[PDB]
Amino acid sequence: GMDLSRINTWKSKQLKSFLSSKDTFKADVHGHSASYYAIADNNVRLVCTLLNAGALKNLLENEFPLHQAATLEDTKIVKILLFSGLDDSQFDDKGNTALYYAVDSGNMQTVKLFVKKNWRLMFYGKTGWKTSFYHAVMLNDVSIVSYFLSEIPSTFDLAILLSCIHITIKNGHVDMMILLLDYMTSTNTNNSLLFIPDIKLAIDNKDIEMLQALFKYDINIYSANLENVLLDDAEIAKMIIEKHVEYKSDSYTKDLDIVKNNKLDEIISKNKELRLMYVNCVK
Amino acid sequence: GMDLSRINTWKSKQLKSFLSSKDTFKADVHGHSASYYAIADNNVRLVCTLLNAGALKNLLENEFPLHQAATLEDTKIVKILLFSGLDDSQFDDKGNTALYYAVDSGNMQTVKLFVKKNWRLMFYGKTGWKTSFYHAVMLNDVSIVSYFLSEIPSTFDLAILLSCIHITIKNGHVDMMILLLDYMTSTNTNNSLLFIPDIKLAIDNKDIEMLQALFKYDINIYSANLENVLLDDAEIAKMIIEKHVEYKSDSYTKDLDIVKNNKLDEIISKNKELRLMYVNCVK
């Protein structure tokens, strides 16, 4: 019955012997190998000695050393393991990459390490909800996400953008949404209004800073059936009307089919408060 | 059944005749008086004609003209009604002041009007949760709150600060929290660590931007029992330890009793992972 947990305190004689034994790459009574303890203590010298003895040719079915090394602040074991030929896109038993754990541990230097290797790693995961990009968004880690976006090539269109927007609006992360909105605006190649799915959610919560930030951008106020809410809350109704009025005088928007044949003007004309709001927007 | 809803169209003759009648200050079939419709329309000239005929000496129990005028963007009727001697601190049938409705409508000019008159108005309401100040916080209206704080005299300590912080952290309003935190720091006359009740809330949610903003201030990391959470999540545990370590080197904090006799050092020293983190801060 074996216990390796104290391996980092062993001297040469005991380690050398151990590494000669038939036990050297077995898991102990706690279920961990020697590589696991060396990594956990950031024992670079020991890690390498284990690697020199053939530890990576004898990994168990539940051990993912790269994923483990990704939680360390010192990136050296991660460098060593990549040099040894470990695959940076491998999933563990929870469908996560090593990058995911660098995000989850907030190790920026390890995040930058994997992303300089290939930026595509930020979008690998068993599910969309298991990608390093989405997890950064979900954690409201504005630094990591700002960094991720600076590394997406223009040649690429973010697919998972709608799930990100949802969780962001839902949980009130306004700086995050500004980042996502700046990115949508800058990659708006067909020059249309921005489709924000959960604008209804921000209305219902009435987060004034969130709404004010949304309305700074060329958002699609029409494909949300927002005309239904113009008689609901006047402060918000005024923001929508102000936007609509702007869209009717902006050459970028005034001749769009969505603006021309809108169902808002109908509701505005039938009500008196809304009419007041409109004409006060016009100057 | 009498109906006054068109009154804003009436001409002087019909109006002059109605103001002579015994019906002049009754509510109609819809339940509204003439002043109500005039106000709703922002019909300043008609409001004044109604005031001149004695409308304010004949208010019914459910009539709150100032609260109604506060929802208008034009502040003129609010000015008129205050000249006529209406009480700016009166509660309506819901325990709210007129200022509450200026906040709820987002009318900054009306907010500034009531506050220049009497800054204390921002803290009047049936309950703490009905104050204009709390309502602005709950709406995440950072502009209104930023304005309100600039108008609190140093001679005053804000009482409701507790519930404002709760709602802010519960709902992820980082810029709001930053406002409240700068205010707390500015008025920290006892030069103590900041007491932040819902710290455990931001830990459970793991909002990285919220936690990073919280940890920039001299917050009380000790009166939360946080040592409990040091073995839970390593990214967060590391922010706590970094802070604690700084508190032991800062002359502002190192000789505080709460720091000296802390329950964290215990837990730090018993765990290898924790001592790892501790020693890396410590350089």
From TrEMBL, chains A, B:
Annotated compartments: Host cytoplasm; Host nucleus
ANK repeats: 61-93
Keyword Repeat: yes
Superkingdom assignment: Viruses
Keywords: ANK repeat, Early protein, Host cytoplasm, Host nucleus, Host-virus interaction, Inhibition of host innate immune response by virus, Inhibition of host NF-kappa-B by virus, Repeat, Viral immunoevasion
One of the protein's GO biological processes: symbiont-mediated suppression of host innate immune response
Protein name: K1L
Source organism (scientific name): Vaccinia virus
